[PDB]
Amino acid sequence: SQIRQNYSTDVEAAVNSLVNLYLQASYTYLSLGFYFDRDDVALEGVSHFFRELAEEKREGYERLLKMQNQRGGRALFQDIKKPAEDEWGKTPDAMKAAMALEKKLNQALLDLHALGSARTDPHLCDFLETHFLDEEVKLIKKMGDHLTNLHRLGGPEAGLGEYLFERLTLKH
Amino acid sequence: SQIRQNYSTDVEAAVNSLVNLYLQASYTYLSLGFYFDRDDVALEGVSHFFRELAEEKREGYERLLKMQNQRGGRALFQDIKKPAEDEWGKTPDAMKAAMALEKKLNQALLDLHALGSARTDPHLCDFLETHFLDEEVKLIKKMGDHLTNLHRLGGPEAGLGEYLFERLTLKH
Amino acid sequence: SQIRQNYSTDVEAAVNSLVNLYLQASYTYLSLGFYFDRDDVALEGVSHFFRELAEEKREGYERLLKMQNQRGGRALFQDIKKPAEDEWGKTPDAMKAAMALEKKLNQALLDLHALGSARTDPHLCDFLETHFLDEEVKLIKKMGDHLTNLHRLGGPEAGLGEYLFERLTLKH
Amino acid sequence: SQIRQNYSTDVEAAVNSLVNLYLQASYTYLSLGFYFDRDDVALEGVSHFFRELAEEKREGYERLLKMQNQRGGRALFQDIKKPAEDEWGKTPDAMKAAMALEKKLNQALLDLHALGSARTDPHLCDFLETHFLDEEVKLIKKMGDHLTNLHRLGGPEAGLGEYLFERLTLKH
Ligand SMILES: [Fe+3]
Ligand SMILES: [Fe+3]
Ligand SMILES: [Fe+3]
Ligand SMILES: [Fe+3]
Ligand SMILES: [Fe+3]
Ligand SMILES: [Fe+3]
Ligand SMILES: [Fe+3]
Ligand SMILES: [Fe+3]
Ligand SMILES: [Fe+3]
Ligand SMILES: [Fe+3]
Ligand SMILES: [Fe+3]
Ligand SMILES: [Fe+3]
Ligand SMILES: [Fe+3]
Ligand SMILES: [Fe+3]
Ligand SMILES: [Fe+3]
Ligand SMILES: [Fe+3]
Ligand SMILES: [Fe+3]
Ligand SMILES: [Fe+3]
Ligand SMILES: [Fe+3]
Ligand SMILES: [Fe+3]
Ligand SMILES: [Fe+3]
Ligand SMILES: [Fe+3]
Ligand SMILES: [Fe+3]
Ligand SMILES: [Fe+3]
Ligand SMILES: [Fe+3]
Ligand SMILES: [Fe+3]
Ligand SMILES: [O]
Ligand SMILES: [O]
Ligand SMILES: [O]
Ligand SMILES: [O]
């Protein structure tokens, strides 16, 4: 590139990888989104929650792609692996799947910050600090709070709790 | 003071004491406030309730400090004792702790009115009558009502009741 | 915590410590605030300056407590040590006390950034960088400017300078 | 009176006395007001301060007269004693005269509250508590603050301080 400066081939390839990971997470959220709208699941607020996460994740990869172009990197796409399940169980299960996905995304973000820090790339570090890390922290805190409210509503009287949580906590 | 008039050294020192008591109650409410926002407690409305009480208590001590200055008293600060617990249990427990704290504040207010009455200080008596006593009565009535609603929602099906009360009674 | 990730027990405890330090500074500012409103001190603008600092410091600890909850830390409170003086002298003295307090807060902030940097916690580093460090720099620069204006107004004609500075520099 | 109830002849006569005292204070403030507008005194803000006090004191006696009528008392007027001085010196002197007058008014108010308390007349006590006592406290605190600012501006460079205080503190 006529423009590339302080932009290591390692960051470029790790950014390409994080992009595939965002694409895959978006895809997972899409699947959870339509799943909770099945006539036999029918939890509109849960469906909305996950549709919104698919949308947020898309913004993630679009922003990584834009930063790749701005630094003089070359985007390279791989296949997007289908989501890990085709049925997602009940709200607690789905929510725990989502937690696990967000934890993996967060680790991948932290790993890429560590790497850019190690290649003294402060622009890349700042970029992640600004557009990604706090977003992850806030979102994980929110899923944790959700898991705590579902747990409190679970046990013997499981079905009623799931209805109430979707109705009184999730936006529909 | 060039300004002090009918202001006994006893009232002045008791006002200093009530100030430390307000500081301490504010501090207790702060602690209850963040506690109910822990990812493993996650009761936003309860957290809001107690944050608001911390704020109200701060107004209390600021008003006592201002009246101290207006009467020609000298403020004197002591250490603020940390709250009595670091974990606050469930909503009923926290609410009973709050009740007990408010009852102690009310007794301390009544005691200071008695004392100013005994030093024939009608300004101090009126000041408490106007800015403190009815506030205490209204607030204790509210915590009592809350305790009655939690009791009605308690027993075997404890977790569900706590969710509903936070959702349908507390402002979030 | 179901949510904690990359959050060292050292940062958590140092955050708890910084919280007690903010509580203590807020308390010091409260004391300076009412002091300058005594009928025998009577410098409304100075009183306003310090009341505002008490308020800002409270925002500080509330933000640290919120970040503690978001990271999955557990808040732990200690006693709040009373302010170091009960009488604060003249504006120059108070202002130098405030400078010293802000310098200690700044060092404690820098130390905690160093520590999170050493535990490769970029979220914590960014958090301080964003909500604390520049605030400290701006405020210390402002107290320094104030000290320079008081010095210029001091010396033989001390009392007049203190009146003018409160009237023509501080917001009342 | 067809209306009088729980209204002792002692309160009635003490209310008549407090009225003459308010009339006299109003008269004193009138005198201080025009004095500071003499071409050879020429302190507009000081003049305004005292004119305003004359006005406030008039409201005082009008309110006592109205309450006398409402309780079924009979107003009785005596002569109004001329003010104690015809020349009032400099701002510090006038302000100390005003302080002394307000202290005497406050004592007379406290004495009348004590008396109505002793005749178990809660209406009269409340009336004073509501329309008089806090007004006195606030005003004395304000004169004290003023005296502190004048003192700080006094000494060798007396004339300049008096100009600045009238210009930068008093409303003109
Ligand atoms: Fe959307
Ligand atoms: Fe969105
Ligand atoms: Fe967005
Ligand atoms: Fe969007
Ligand atoms: Fe399957
Ligand atoms: Fe950085
Ligand atoms: Fe509030
Ligand atoms: Fe409030
Ligand atoms: Fe309020
Ligand atoms: Fe408020
Ligand atoms: Fe414990
Ligand atoms: Fe009353
Ligand atoms: Fe009253
Ligand atoms: Fe009363
Ligand atoms: Fe403010
Ligand atoms: Fe502020
Ligand atoms: Fe602020
Ligand atoms: Fe603010
Ligand atoms: Fe001392
Ligand atoms: Fe940064
Ligand atoms: Fe930054
Ligand atoms: Fe007027
Ligand atoms: Fe008026
Ligand atoms: Fe008026
Ligand atoms: Fe008026
Ligand atoms: Fe004379
Ligand atoms: O978004
Ligand atoms: O409030
Ligand atoms: O603030
Ligand atoms: O007035």
List chain D residues with CB under 8 Å of C92: none
The one-letter code for the residue type at B24 is Q
Q: What is the gyration radius of the CA atoms in chain C, in angstroms?
A: 18
Query: Where do the DSSP E strands lie in chain A?
Result: none
Ligand 18 centroid to C79 CA: how many Å?
25
- In angstroms, the CA B136 to CA B21 distance is 14
Phi and psi at residue A117, to the nearest 5°: -55, -40
In three-state form (DSSP H/G/I as H, E/B as E, the rest C), the secondary structure along B107-165 is HHHHHHHHHHHHCCCHHHHHHHHHHHHHHHHHHHHHHHHHHHHHHHCCHHHHHHHHHHH
Residues 6+ apart with CB under 8 A from A75: A16, A19, A65, A68, A69
Residues 6+ apart with CB under 8 A from A19: A61, A64, A65, A68, A75, A77
A152 vs A19, A90, A103, A157, B48, CA distance in Å?
36, 15, 23, 10, 20
Q: Are B170 and B49 in contact (CB under 8 A)?
A: yes
List chain B residues with CB under 8 Å of A141: 39
Q: Name the residue with the closest Cα to ligand 27, atom 1.
A: A56
D127 vs B113, B123, D103, CA distance in Å?
19, 12, 19
Ligand 26 centroid to A73 CA: how many Å?
93
Closest residue, chain D, to B126 (C-alpha): D129
- In angstroms, the CA C79 to CA B31 distance is 12
Residue D129 in contact with ligand 30 by CB distance below 6 A: no
Q: What is the DSSP letter of D83?
A: P
Question: What is the largest distance, in Å, between two alpha-carbon atoms of chain D?
Answer: 65
The 3-state DSSP class for residue A38 equals coil
Cα angle B53-B58-B63, degrees, rounded to a multiple of 5 = 125
How is residue A24 written in tokens? 């895959």
Closest approach of B140 to chain A, Cα-based (Å):
28
Residues β-bridged to residue C80? B80
Q: Name the residue with the closest Cα to ligand 30, atom 1.
A: D56
Cβ neighbours, 10 Å, residue C41 = 22
* Residues whose beta carbon lies within 6 Å of some atom of ligand 29: C 55-56, 59
The 3-state DSSP class for residue B80 equals strand
Q: What is the gyration radius of the CA atoms in chain A, in angstroms?
A: 18
**Exposed / middle / buried, residue B156 (Cβ in 10 Å: 0-12, 13-18, 19+):** exposed
What domains are there in chain A, each with its CATH number?
1-172 (1.20.1260.10)
- In angstroms, the CA A116 to CA A36 distance is 39
Phi and psi at residue B170, to the nearest 5°: -85, 145
Q: Are C99 and C140 in contact (CB under 8 A)?
A: yes
D61 vs A62, C9, D3, D65, D101, CA distance in Å?
77, 69, 22, 6, 15
Nearest to D75 by CA among D86, D63, D84: D63
How is residue A50 written in tokens? 């996950």
Residues β-bridged to residue B80? C80
The one-letter code for the residue type at D58 is R
Structure resolution, Å:
2.3
The 3-state DSSP class for residue B67 equals helix
The one-letter code for the residue type at C33 is G
Nearest to A54 by CA among A18, A84, A98, A92: A98
Closest approach of A50 to chain B, Cα-based (Å):
20
Experimental method: X-ray
- In angstroms, the CA D118 to CA D133 distance is 18
The 3-state DSSP class for residue C80 equals strand
Which of D151, D154, D157 minimises the CB distance to C157?
D157
Q: Are A143 and A102 in contact (CB under 8 A)?
A: yes
> Where would I find the H helices in C4-153?
9-35, 44-71, 91-118, 122-128, 134-152
DSSP A125-167: HHHHIIIIIHHHHHHHHHHHHHHHHHHHT-GGGHHHHHHHHHH
